[PDB]
């Protein structure tokens, strides 16, 4: 698929707001994912044990993982579609080392969209959400094709 430049602008305009507080957004998004889809928390051996939202809020490792995941995603979006090198190491560790199903990447995309909508209503109207959804479907479709080359799902 191909986003137009106007779509990339809408995505990079709300991402510039997320980058004012990367750790806070990282926490919100990982907690929204785990509450909504608790099976995904089993994939993180260093968190697994967390039982409540309060325990998640207070975990410095979960907050670090959020910053690590958002920073890598931010670096992919800033490429505007030219992200093949960035995607290679990321597809290899999520398919072979962590074993993350494409479905889980759909769940986090949902959690990202939920959090931006709550925190940034004025920059995340319908056209900006449509553009972010397109950018995340592009990311999921390029990662799924890599998985398939790497010997996982496809
Ligand atoms: C926007 C999507 C995602 C991005 C950009 C992302 C990025 C990363 C990055 C950069 C790391 C550190 C290096 C590495 O292992 O490759 C990481 C580790 C990890 N990711 Fe993700 N990830 C994404 C989605 C997910 C999802 C959905 C899950 C779980 C359902 C997952 C589970 C993990 C696990 C288990 C690790 C190891 C964490 C730890 O050992 O500290 N990732 N991810």
Curated annotation (Swiss-Prot):
It comes from Physeter macrocephalus. Monomeric. The lineage of its organism: Eukaryota, Metazoa, Chordata, Craniata, Vertebrata. It is found in: Cytoplasm, Sarcoplasm. The modification Phosphothreonine is found at residue 68. Its main location: cytoplasm. It holds the Pfam family Globin. It comes from the Eukaryota. Nitrite binds at residue 65. This is Myoglobin. One of its GO terms (biological process) is removal of superoxide radicals. Residues 2-148 form the Globin domain. O2 binds at residue 65.
């Amino acid at each position: 698929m191909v986003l137009s430049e106007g779509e990339w602008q809408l995505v990079l305009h709300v991402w510039a707001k997320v980058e004012a507080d990367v750790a806070g957004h990282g926490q919100d998004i990982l907690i929204r994912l785990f509450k909504s889809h608790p099976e995904t928390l089993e994939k993180f051996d260093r968190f697994k044990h967390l039982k409540t939202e309060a325990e998640m809020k207070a975990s410095e490792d979960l907050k670090k993982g959020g910053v690590t995941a958002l920073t890598a995603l931010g670096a992919i979006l800033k490429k505007k579609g030219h992200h093949e090198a960035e995607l290679k190491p990321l597809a290899q560790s999520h398919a072979t080392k962590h074993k993350i199903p494409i479905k889980y990447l759909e769940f986090i995309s949902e959690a990202i969209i939920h959090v931006l909508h709550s925190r940034h209503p004025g920059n995340f109207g319908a056209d900006a959400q449509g553009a972010m959804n397109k950018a995340l479907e592009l990311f999921r479709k390029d990662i799924a094709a890599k998985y398939k080359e790497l010997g996982y799902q496809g």
